[PDB]
Point group: D2
Chain length 226, copies 4
């Protein structure tokens, strides 16, 4: 009965407080999602000045409730089943041969808006590595995100490896370990194993002078025909 909150266009609000190797920063984001098409549009502004890490590294952190679950897979959509109350999304993101991000987020409805409020901590980054050295290109690849139930936590476990292209033609992996648990006590759907196929386009606003990211995503669940 959470799926019905997502049949139309839903306003999104995103706020993040972060710290990577002692570099403090905040980001605010806003846009809208239309989960019927698995589509979302968001714009992010670093409100504390220059972002200390590359924008691409925060795409996964900045609302999987907006994925398109096709009609035959609707019994497997944990994300929307947890709403309006929401879910807590936690991750550890291991940058290959560099630091890690640990994030904790609350994804829930605040009135009619879907809010994603995040805290992020980055530790052990090389000062001249690809992340703090700003060596990633401003683009993004398409991935598969593997979901499985975690029946003991009443939530789900999620694993995927992001590929960030590097300015020299190599690739920086970011291994994502994730867990989602309901905030409410209402019943949730615990899905069968499946995956999400993702696509992301990064761009800029020609008239925006603050450091910023314009993001459009398409995400569609697949994997189950039983």
């Amino acid at each position: 009965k959470g799926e019905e909150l997502f049949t139309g266009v839903v306003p999104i609000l995103v706020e993040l407080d972060g710290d990577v190797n002692g570099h403090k920063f905040s980001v605010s984001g806003e846009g809208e999602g239309d989960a019927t098409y698995g589509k979302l549009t968001l714009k992010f502004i670093c409100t504390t000045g220059k972002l200390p890490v590359p924008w691409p590294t925060l795409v996964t952190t900045f609302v999987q409730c907006f994925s398109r679950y096709p009609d035959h897979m609707k019994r497997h959509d944990f994300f929307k089943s947890a709403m309006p109350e929401g879910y807590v999304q936690e991750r550890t993101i291991f940058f290959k041969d560099d630091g890690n991000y640990k994030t904790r987020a609350e994804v829930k409805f605040e009135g009619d808006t879907l809010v994603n409020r995040i805290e992020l901590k980055g530790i052990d980054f090389k000062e001249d590595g690809n992340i703090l050295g700003h060596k990633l290109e401003y683009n993004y690849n398409s991935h598969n995100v593997y979901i499985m139930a975690d029946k003991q936590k009443n939530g789900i476990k999620v694993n995927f490896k992001i590929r960030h292209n590097i300015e020299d033609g190599s690739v920086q992996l970011a291994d994502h370990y994730q867990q989602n648990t309901p905030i409410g006590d209402g019943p949730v759907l615990l899905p069968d194993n499946h995956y999400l196929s993702t696509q992301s386009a990064l761009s800029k606003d020609p008239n925006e002078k603050r450091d910023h990211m314009v993001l459009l995503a398409f995400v569609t669940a697949a994997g189950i025909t039983h």
Copy 2:
């Protein structure tokens, strides 16, 4: 050979001259595509006044060389192999229980830009139908586009059905019959049967008073692992 021209961001120009049931109209489009990511961005303006048909019905008419062909399918990308000389793309589009569009286009490079120049004729539309009655929603679904070689023409045949959501909650089908033939006479890649998986985002430029459409697309080839 031709695929070398698409390894970076390529400027695009679209030009269409149309006539639907005698209603004449012209649209110009511009933007860019990055085939490495199967992505493109374009803004279309109706330069003659209001569009007499819904914008969504012209998305497929308005550069399948911008699809992403994964490296294991590179031998199957007819579209870029015809470049720079280009190809002619012709369609009959049958709107179920209504009229049809017939289109002929030349897609080729003119300098450094990839231009799509089109002529379109629509006949037999119902004045009270979904098309001239403007009853299509401003949204777009994801499709599978089926491609097969047409050896005798040294080109390809392509077939697919677009699903246009109507404001009354029904879907209007648009059955596409398409053929592509190279403009040049040199060798082109003729593919084994496969498909392209498409996603399209339609939106509006908030600063624009003319009738127009902003489109972002993602398209990736699939269906071949040999």
Copy 3:
């Protein structure tokens, strides 16, 4: 309606009368299929002596109603909707750089059994080619079979290319052009574009002295999530 006849194990009979370059031959087959699992098992015997062509070249000729259509695609299964009256299945099979087979078959129920009765004519084969020179390996690859409705015939058009491994390490293509038309005149399901994914195991019955083939197949429809 027709799909009700395939919820359990259905006996199958196959009968083919062939003529390739004047070499006449007949084959009979029998076994069973379980469409719930998209599976079938058949044993074929050449009742006239040795087969004048390789067994693998006749696998596609020798009951696509035994495919598994997942429940979200049940509206798209033309094959079972034509049952019990059946359909006529016709092909032209073009062996690249060699001859062609033309086939006409009636697939329908005769009592409780689903029988596939075929006539095949092969012309223009090279005496030293891979087919009459028996140079095909006794193995079979997995394919994607593309299906589209052919509204005017109230049937379907199907296209695919089979890859036959040759003993010298090369692959021999067999381009299939196929059309299916219902034998009865009542309504049938006409599908949206989709495909079937096929797998075939060929083997020998260790106790059998006649020329023969044991075949097990798995086939499942895909490509539609709407």
Copy 4:
């Protein structure tokens, strides 16, 4: 350099010692695999008399080195990279609302034959549940098996949920937790996340009087196009 041991047909030997709730049993199996097609054929004999659990429940226990990894995914085939030395395959299989199986197997080459030597322990089964009550049907569904690297163990972690149809029309889940670790010290490929699509056909030998299972499987890896 382990992939080369699987280019042709490879003899398989399977031996299992088990005990489920104090019911001791042994099974021997033999056949052959052709990983180029992702294909295997095996026959099992309960050599201690009547099998105490349903044959379908042991299919997953009775050589993922026989999966077909298509050419573009060959850097992700952990199973063949570990050969000739092999890997240890461990699982816990939780039957929903019933007992669990814990298995440990050695999969390695013994001369030219690929051997799978297993020990299985079943605990906590209901004496009249679906397993010890012999309530499962003799058939099998197709599944996706999700693979991820376990870089700390130099092996892989595997999760999937088998669906066993029950004689009353319901389904018995069997949740599979699996881990594979190399037996040798040679280097192995640690794959990116991906999955295997499986298909299995169970049958009987008309002339065999011992309790037995005849099994044919097709398995193909998918999921990676980078």
